[PDB]
Design an enzyme around this catalytic site. Structure first.
Site, PDB file in Angstrom:
ATOM      1  N   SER A 153      47.204  47.237 -74.143  1.00  0.00           N
ATOM      2  CA  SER A 153      47.657  48.251 -74.150  1.00  0.00           C
ATOM      3  C   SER A 153      49.099  48.717 -74.186  1.00  0.00           C
ATOM      4  O   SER A 153      48.959  49.582 -72.705  1.00  0.00           O
ATOM      5  CB  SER A 153      46.933  49.335 -73.366  1.00  0.00           C
ATOM      6  OG  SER A 153      45.375  49.773 -73.751  1.00  0.00           O
ATOM      7  N   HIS A 154      49.744  47.410 -74.416  1.00  0.00           N
ATOM      8  CA  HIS A 154      51.944  47.345 -74.056  1.00  0.00           C
ATOM      9  C   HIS A 154      51.531  48.049 -75.431  1.00  0.00           C
ATOM     10  O   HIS A 154      53.155  47.277 -75.394  1.00  0.00           O
ATOM     11  CB  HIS A 154      51.875  45.937 -73.252  1.00  0.00           C
ATOM     12  CG  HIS A 154      50.977  45.845 -71.998  1.00  0.00           C
ATOM     13  ND1 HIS A 154      50.477  44.056 -72.337  1.00  0.00           N
ATOM     14  CD2 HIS A 154      50.620  46.770 -71.331  1.00  0.00           C
ATOM     15  CE1 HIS A 154      49.944  44.256 -70.743  1.00  0.00           C
ATOM     16  NE2 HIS A 154      50.217  45.382 -70.058  1.00  0.00           N
ATOM     17  N   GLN A 155      51.673  48.849 -76.303  1.00  0.00           N
ATOM     18  CA  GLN A 155      52.401  49.022 -77.225  1.00  0.00           C
ATOM     19  C   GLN A 155      53.869  49.953 -77.002  1.00  0.00           C
ATOM     20  O   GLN A 155      53.678  50.860 -75.992  1.00  0.00           O
ATOM     21  CB  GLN A 155      51.660  50.187 -77.869  1.00  0.00           C
ATOM     22  CG  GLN A 155      51.560  51.453 -77.621  1.00  0.00           C
ATOM     23  CD  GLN A 155      49.898  51.771 -76.535  1.00  0.00           C
ATOM     24  OE1 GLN A 155      49.197  50.672 -75.752  1.00  0.00           O
ATOM     25  NE2 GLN A 155      49.228  53.178 -76.597  1.00  0.00           N
TER      26      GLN A 155
END
Ligand SMILES: Cc1cc2nc3c(=O)[nH]c(=O)nc-3n(C[C@H](O)[C@H](O)[C@H](O)COP(=O)(O)OP(=O)(O)OC[C@H]3O[C@@H](n4cnc5c(N)ncnc54)[C@H](O)[C@@H]3O)c2cc1C
Ligand SMILES: Cc1cc2nc3c(=O)[nH]c(=O)nc-3n(C[C@H](O)[C@H](O)[C@H](O)COP(=O)(O)OP(=O)(O)OC[C@H]3O[C@@H](n4cnc5c(N)ncnc54)[C@H](O)[C@@H]3O)c2cc1C
Lengths: 649, 649
Positions: A574-576
């Protein structure tokens, strides 16, 4: 109507910080609009263990990142690189945004990436004090529990590092330029000094350590609290329960449950912002000076697009009526990190296996992480930067946890049970993950959880009719993510092999066997790397290779079978980020190109993903925006002993 | 400043029909609000083959049901019965709703379900003329291409039916009460009469046939057009380009790209509806008489909930401010159908396998479907209705298509390639699918693609310490969907075995082998069924059986391994319904309980899923709503030769 000088959209890692310091350092009216609300009395949020499901109702046992009351549900389009899968990735929805719901691993990301992959003015010496600010405001803690396996792993990495250093090979995954002749691996002697992957001057680009830093604080009763952007910046010392700033911060107004739709323009000047309250009533906020968009990598571009900033031809085609500035790059350049999972079985007598796997349980001070490293490029990765031999790039974040971190379907298919107490997890997270995607609103009316999000990962290379020699450089790029992920497996394979020695040296009667992906396949991969050397990856495309030998076919088969695992034996991080990045959607002052007075100050502005988890970088960009907007380095100049005072309520 | 007597939310299967005839049969102002717009000039929609991707741009090759411009993206919560998977199911978004994007198989659903599972006033003789009306308005077509394999399959089913009939067994999957001594299987002679699964009086409950009926029409130039609720009821003969009804329909007003938020109340009377246009401008629509909600099973309840109708304790907990009526059943009772996939390999000489698999290619007149049947309960299904021996229930819809219909990951794992021309697909769709779910908005502000949608399918049964006999009726219910799905496999296995005989009788030198799920496992399943009979399903819970023989253990293992396949070797249908059903959220007049003047008239009102695809029932409910609102059987009495006149533009 509400009227503000600076109107900020999204109280996430960046927006919370930005709002707080703009209010402190100016006499301006600051308005922060957030889609969710505060969770200062919600144990799901306030207890760091709530992340792991501690307070989940048994009949609705879903994580915050799966729960629409806690987050946006960013369902992406079919992944052509992973059998059409459609992972649903969250942005947190509330005070603090994703830091409200994240796993709290606080990582700066290293000097090298900012020095090389970010533009002038955004080099590491330009940002290191903002990073320092971000860290001291949180004041993260180290793991409170030493595990033997961590020392065994470190000593194994020490050996490999020694092997690599001695070999004189220019690039390999444990080499670190700044630390000279010595393996940059934390010592395992009694009074060993911790190595700090977040060291201020960025010496530790590649480094192995016993502990990450978690965004938690210990309270006077001994309990731990999540220490995140929400309660750090928007707590009751600074903002009252009705959202009105207090004292020196009285210029601040935080509007809870305010779902912003778009920005209103007069020519190319933003003059207002619309949002809808929880009663479904629409409100207009007048803007005197600037709008700052900090709604996260998925949504910041969707606000700009609905507002008329983006690809005019596409926007018109779906009925966006008011067009402001044509920039087809808006929402493009989406990046993320990616985490294939490996599982190891520890063999030996039960009491000895148990002793060896002791002290690994997750608690707030470690969030399950028992090490281990920020690693560099594998020597056999063909896609290193041109100057990778003269400066040390981060390529993998190596994490060790208890348990069996693969998806439930893979637990079933593999026969590897989460209830087996002789198994543990190692993850080589690709933090220079090559895939690039893009985001497009599907409709013009309102914000939606699901814009179009295209993000294809482990795609195949389809041979053309061109000469092989002309094709290989194309396949090299196409296969970059598969290449790196398999090399990640080999890194872990190497580590475990040395752990077989260092476990014995430390008096543990155990042996370790990589069992996910299949031991036989990793064994074969390791052998192939030695056999074929640099062009090993050609065997991803057997029809172009022309090796019709039993050995050649078997190695092609081995790579074919292994390509399955990074696709589904894994989690998309979840490091967009980077969907509205400096040099593409905004300039180096973070101003949206084509506008007088709109800025983007969240992770979507990032020029290139940091070497590690992204919270720090997201807040760092917000931090810099404070000083950019006010026109002087106020926040950079603030003494480090002056930090926000935490109020739990 | 729109004002209407009847305001309808959603131009779907139900809403389009409802709006059209209410305008025709009354002098009232009818307003239809639709989130999307018309696609009458969109070949993706208008060409039936567009469904299969004929007009997909190659760089964005996604189906309409995956495309946010064409649909709502209903991402559900982790499925505890399928490894935490989160299927994303669509509602179409535009004129015609889901009929704009669906596969056009038009199926009434049979007499039995309405007579037994629907309440008084909604029995089959109550709805059959509304169904007839839905059908004649479309005028669907049969498959224009006879394929030999269809005839082989029919003759194979003929044999099995004869044996079931001959055995005198009270219930089995090819028995049909209304057709006496003869197999209710379509004959395969030269001048054979087609059997019609939608026969007016519902004689054909269980029935095998060569062709379904597709919602397409042939134009005078020979091309085919999608014939759906959108262009049937809202084309340019009836509604002009500005959304204004024409002539006799001039009381109708259709507002395109109007995303409705909630219904406004004075006490328990609806007086208005809010929506947001494509510029983000909010509008209030005044209501003189009634609101009718027709936004689909996922979204109709979310509109009611945001409007203050639902579980007060939950709604308050997420910030819904204006509470109108406490009914916790709103959004509960979600049902769907479910399609496990099987693959068969055809053995023999290539020219002979090819001859045997010829004429199966999809075209508009068949949408890929080459048969085959509506089937009843397997004799060994322990969960039959009490009167299943005296009236014939539909339990499976049996479909045959060319190609390899399992998901891409399963194609890889199984080694069954979509490019192998000796493979084809059979699906026993469970159309009395036991699982039940529910929908809850996560936030109060605006409509979202992603409310909470809980729908857990093949969940496990966990043994307790209570006596076996006391546990079995519980496990019987818990395991109902796995039980039925595995029996679906046996049905197909039986069918293929008989096809091995009839293929030869029909002059084909081929053999047929079920290869997905694994042939060995299906072989073992069939034998276990014969060996253990009625209580075969006890072996899903081996610890309760206490059969520690090798034979017993192997059968337990067989069921264990097979349980994998309905979980992931399958597709969840897009037939979601029943979330606001008669007797729970609305009364038998479709009035929302607790309100003076709101109705639900779409598939969410359905009391029980029809025995087959759901478009017909959805339109049927809308059809009846016309007559319920107007207070006389106007639509029921309309002669069948009077149908909407189609305009393509
Ligand atoms: C499950 C999960 C685990 C993670 N684990 C880690 C970790 O261990 N360490 C780490 O460094 N990083 C991790 N991250 C990533 C990190 O938290 C984010 O990268 C960081 O928060 C990005 O900050 P941001 O300001 O750019 O956006 P966000 O933090 O996501 O903030 C976006 C804000 O904008 C608001 N918003 C969006 N749209 C609207 C609108 N229309 N109107 C009003 N408000 C709106 C959102 O509600 C949200 O509050 C994790 C993230 C998740 C989801
Ligand atoms: C991909 C797919 C394949 C299918 N295949 C078949 C098949 O082969 N045969 C068959 O019989 N059935 C099939 N169906 C199912 C069938 O189409 C539906 O069951 C039927 O259309 C349900 O009709 P409905 O009126 O209840 O809702 P819908 O048809 O789905 O229409 C709902 C309408 O409400 C609108 N709406 C929703 N929210 C709002 C809002 N806030 N404001 C304004 N408007 C709103 C939507 O845009 C939509 O237009 C399929 C469906 C899909 C998605």
């Amino acid at each position: 109507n509400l009227t503000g000088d600076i109107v900020i959209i999204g109280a996430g890692a960046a927006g919370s910080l930005l709002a707080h310091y703009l209010a402190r350092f100016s006499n301006m009216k600051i308005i922060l609009l957030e889609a969710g609300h505060s969770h200062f009395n919600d144990p799901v949020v306030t207890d760091p263990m709530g992340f792991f499901g501690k307070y989940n109702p048994p009949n609705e046992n879903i994580s915050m990142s799966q729960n629409p009351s806690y987050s946006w549900q960013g369902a992406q389009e079919p992944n052509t690189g992973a059998y059409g899968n459609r992972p649903i990735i969250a942005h947190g929805m509330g005070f603090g945004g994703s830091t409200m719901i994240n796993r709290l691993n606080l990582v700066v990301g290293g000097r090298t990436v900012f020095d090389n992959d970010w533009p002038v003015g955004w080099k590491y010496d330009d940002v290191k004090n903002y990073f320092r600010r971000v860290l001291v405001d949180i004041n993260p803690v180290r793991d409170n529990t030493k595990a033997s396996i961590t020392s065994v792993a470190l000593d194994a990495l020490r050996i490999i590092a020694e092997q690599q250093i001695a070999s004189g090979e220019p690039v390999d995954f444990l080499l670190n330029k700044a630390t000279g002749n010595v393996p940059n691996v934390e010592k395992t002697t009694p009074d060993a000094v911790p190595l700090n992957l977040n060291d201020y001057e960025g010496v530790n680009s590649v480094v192995a350590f016993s502990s990450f830093y978690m965004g938690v604080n210990q309270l006077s009763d001994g309990n731990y609290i999540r220490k995140y952007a929400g309660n750090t910046y928007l707590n009751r010392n600074y903002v009252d329960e009705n959202g009105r700033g207090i004292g020196k911060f009285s210029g601040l107004r935080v509007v809870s449950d305010a779902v912003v739709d778009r920005i209103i323009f007069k020519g190319n000047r933003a003059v207002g912002v619309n949002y809808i309250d929880r009663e479904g009533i629409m409100h207009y906020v007048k803007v005197n000076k600037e709008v700052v968009v900090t709604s996260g990598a998925f949504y910041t571009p969707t606000i700009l697009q609905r507002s008329g900033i983006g690809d005019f031809t596409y926007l018109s085609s779906i009925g966006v009526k008011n067009l402001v500035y044509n920039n087809p790059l808006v929402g493009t350049g989406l990046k993320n990190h990616y985490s294939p999972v490996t599982i190891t079985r520890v063999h030996g007598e039960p009491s000895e296996v148990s002793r060896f796997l002791s002290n690994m349980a997750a608690n707030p001070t470690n969030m399950g992480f028992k090490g281990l490293a920020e690693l560099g490029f594998h020597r056999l990765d063909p896609n290193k930067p041109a100057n990778a031999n003269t400066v040390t790039y981060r390529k993998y974040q190596l994490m060790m946890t208890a348990g069996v971190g693969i998806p439930a379907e893979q637990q079933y298919l593999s026969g590897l049970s989460p209830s087996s107490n002789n198994l543990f997890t190692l993850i080589a997270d690709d933090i220079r993950f090559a895939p690039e995607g893009y985001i497009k609103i599907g409709t013009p009316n309102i914000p939606r959880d699901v814009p179009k999000i295209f993000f294809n990962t482990f795609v195949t290379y389809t041979p053309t009719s061109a000469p092989a020699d002309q094709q290989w450089p194309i396949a090299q790029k196409t296969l970059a993510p598969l290449i790196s992920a398999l090399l990640g497996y080999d890194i872990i394979y190497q580590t475990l092999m040395s752990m077989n020695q260092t476990a014995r040296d430390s008096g543990f009667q155990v042996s370790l066997e990589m069992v996910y992906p299949l031991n036989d396949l990793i064994y074969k991969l390791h052998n192939g790397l030695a056999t074929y050397g640099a062009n090993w990856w050609h065997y991803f495309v057997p029809t172009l290779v022309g090796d019709d030998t039993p050995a050649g076919r078997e190695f092609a088969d081995t790579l074919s079978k292994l390509s399955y695992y990074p696709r589904v034996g894994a989690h998309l991080d979840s490091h967009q980020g980077c969907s509205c990045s400096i040099g593409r959607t905004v300039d180096s002052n973070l101003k949206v190109i084509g506008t007088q007075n709109v800025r983007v100050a969240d992770l979507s502005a990032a020029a290139f993903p940091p070497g590690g988890n992204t919270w720090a970088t997201a807040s760092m960009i917000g931090a810099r925006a404070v000083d950019l907007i006010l026109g002087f380095p106020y926040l950079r100049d603030l003494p480090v002993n002056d930090v926000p005072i935490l109020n739990v309520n």
